[PDB]
């Protein structure tokens, strides 16, 4: 009854550094389709079981989505750190959310490489939970004043992915959607 398809089942997914939020509420959610579609190869879902949540209902059904390299799909988790976890996306601990991921090499991979999916890998500071920061500001590496030129002392924080069909099993791109059901203390709360 509410937009579960339009977030999963579409064509354009933004890169990691500027991932998209999608708030879904004021509906009745039919999770029966998210059970046995046989395509979600990593439906790993923490905190609250999917089976008997139909009795439960609360607001704030925040849903995020993006595309991420295949091997580092494991790195996305509560409290687990690494390359992507420490710099771009970090799921808060004491989680109550629930993650979904699947392979989509059939359509999001073309000959010559799809150089449209960038990502950040340097950052002086770290990330607060459930936060996203986007800025293409360059870094002055050394003592040479840099205006807009690229060189030994001027660095671009974002780096480009290379997606290939012939490439290895762990290198083919995966798509991820993360749900996070949170609620508040105020009563008379809308259900779902």
């Amino acid at each position, epitope marked *: *009854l*509410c*937009p579960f*398809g*339009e*977030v999963f*089942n*579409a*064509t*354009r997914f933004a890169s990691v550094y500027a991932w998209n939020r*999608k708030r879904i509420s004021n509906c009745v959610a039919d999770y029966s389709v998210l059970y046995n579609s046989a395509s979600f190869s990593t439906f790993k879902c923490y905190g609250v079981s999917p089976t008997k949540l139909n009795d439960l209902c609360f607001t704030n059904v925040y849903a995020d989505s993006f595309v991420i390299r295949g091997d580092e799909v494991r790195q996305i988790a509560p409290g687990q750190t690494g390359k992507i976890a420490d710099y771009n996306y970090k799921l808060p601990d004491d989680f109550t959310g629930c993650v979904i991921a699947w392979n989509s090499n*059939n*359509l999001d991979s*073309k*000959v010559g490489g799809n150089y449209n999916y960038l990502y950040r890998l340097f950052r002086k500071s770290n990330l607060k939970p459930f936060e996203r920061d986007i800025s293409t500001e360059i870094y002055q590496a050394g003592s040479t004043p840099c205006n807009g030129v690229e060189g030994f002392n001027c660095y671009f924080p974002l780096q480009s992915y290379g997606f290939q069909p012939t490439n290895g099993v762990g290198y083919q791109p995966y798509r991820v959607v993360v749900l996070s059901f949170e609620l508040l203390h105020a009563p008379a709360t809308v259900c779902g």
Partner: antibody
């Protein structure tokens, strides 16, 4: 298992307007969009437009910005398409269809196409 | 906004054969935004292939779709005598333009 019902054929004289109605049953109307597509006699189909279901935000082709208006009502689960300022070259058939090419809540580009049709609607114009 | 010519407009073939219908555009479009429609004579249209590779609800396995880059192709493999109709290729990546339609007839 779903049902699509349209109105009967129509004959018209130039200068007036025409309004056709499509009724859909078998599913909650507030999750899929409506798509209207017209076909000339013997030629390929042409896109008449897309209308969503809740926010009312539609999308028309680059040809009929000011000559066609499409509206929907979810209470009776019906959709009306009106053509105005019609000329003598508008003798054709029209189709209402369920939409799975654009979202009904968000407005993204999804996977799929018009998968349910109707019995068609003949419209003819002459002097 | 994209010119789409299938060609040829008629590919009349003998019964019990396979047909490799083609749909080719000018610019580039991914394998996610083109669908194949069928138009039976004296009837209403339908849907055949969604997502350029898969099939909708309750469609036999004889209909297969493939292609990428600038060219897409539908293969029928087996030809029953109820599968004679016009075939349309439709894009929806940027706006949407329908194809020209192809008619396949009995070869005798």
């Amino acid at each position: 298992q779903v049902q699509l019902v349209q109105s009967g054929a129509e004959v018209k004289k130039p200068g007036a307007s025409v309004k056709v109605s499509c009724k859909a049953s078998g599913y909650p109307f507030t999750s899929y969009g409506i798509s209207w597509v017209r076909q000339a006699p013997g030629q390929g189909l042409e896109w008449m437009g897309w209308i969503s279901t809740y926010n009312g935000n539609t999308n028309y082709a680059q040809k009929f910005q000011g000559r066609v208006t499409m509206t929907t009502d979810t209470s009776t689960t019906t959709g009306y398409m009106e053509l105005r300022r019609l000329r003598s070259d508008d003798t054709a058939v029209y189709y209402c269809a369920r939409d799975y090419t654009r979202g009904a809540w968000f407005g993204e580009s999804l996977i799929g196409g018009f998968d349910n049709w109707g019995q068609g609607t003949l419209v003819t114009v002459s002097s | 906004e994209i010119v789409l010519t299938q060609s040829p407009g008629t590919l009349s073939l003998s019964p019990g054969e396979r047909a490799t219908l083609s749909c080719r555009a000018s610019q580039t479009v991914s394998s996610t935004s083109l669908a194949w429609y069928q138009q039976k004579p004296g009837q209403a249209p339908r849907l055949l292939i969604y997502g350029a590779s898969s099939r909708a609800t309750g469609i036999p396995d004889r209909f297969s779709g493939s292609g990428s880059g600038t060219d897409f192709t539908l293969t029928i493999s087996r030809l029953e005598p109820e599968d004679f109709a016009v075939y349309y290729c439709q894009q929806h990546d940027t706006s949407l333009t329908f194809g020209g339609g192809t008619k396949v007839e009995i070869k005798r």
